[PDB]
Amino acid sequence: AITGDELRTGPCEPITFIFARGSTEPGLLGITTGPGVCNALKLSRPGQVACQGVGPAYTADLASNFLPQGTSQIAIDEAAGLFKLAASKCPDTKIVAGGYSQGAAVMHGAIRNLPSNVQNMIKGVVLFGDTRNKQDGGRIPNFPTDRTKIYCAFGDLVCDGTLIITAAHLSYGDDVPNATSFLLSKVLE
Description:
Blueprint: E1 15-20, H1 33-44, E2 49-53, H2 73-89, E3 94-100, H3 102-111, H4 116-119, E4 122-128, E5 148-151, H5 176-186
Parallel strand pairs: 1-2, 1-3, 3-4, 4-5
Helix pairs in contact: 1-5, 2-3
InterPro entries: AB_hydrolase_fold, Cutinase/axe, CUTINASE_1, CUTINASE_2, Cutinase_monf
Pfam families: Cutinase
EC number: 3.1.1.74
């Protein structure tokens, strides 16, 4: 019933999207990709999708980028929790996840240590401008690679260890329709 809070503040839905915004984005889903991917998912699959942002624990503050895992534990623990929440509240929901910048880091760290119960509900993961692309080798540790897609724009140097901000980092708007298709591929009807 609330935007970005539909897992927390709503009924169970056949499909549950879980998104972690990039640094300094306001809200739970931000205003860049998740907003898009969300509406895009609901449109393409009316009556089926509930979007849940990751917050407010994940502050998406800049300084957390420099922490060992590239975000905060609180943030990861938060994401972890919501995946489980889905498992608990809605055991028949097909989960799809997303992340941009540090939000991808959140997911990278939350999804890698989820039990098989929960991981097996995650059909698809999309990561834009992943800040852990090189630290984890273009994948999520301990998570099927065919279910993962990483959008790394030409010039986007955060995909390569650094935290350098280019106009290529800010372009993942363009990848929503493709990201959506990827997710939707896996979540068949």
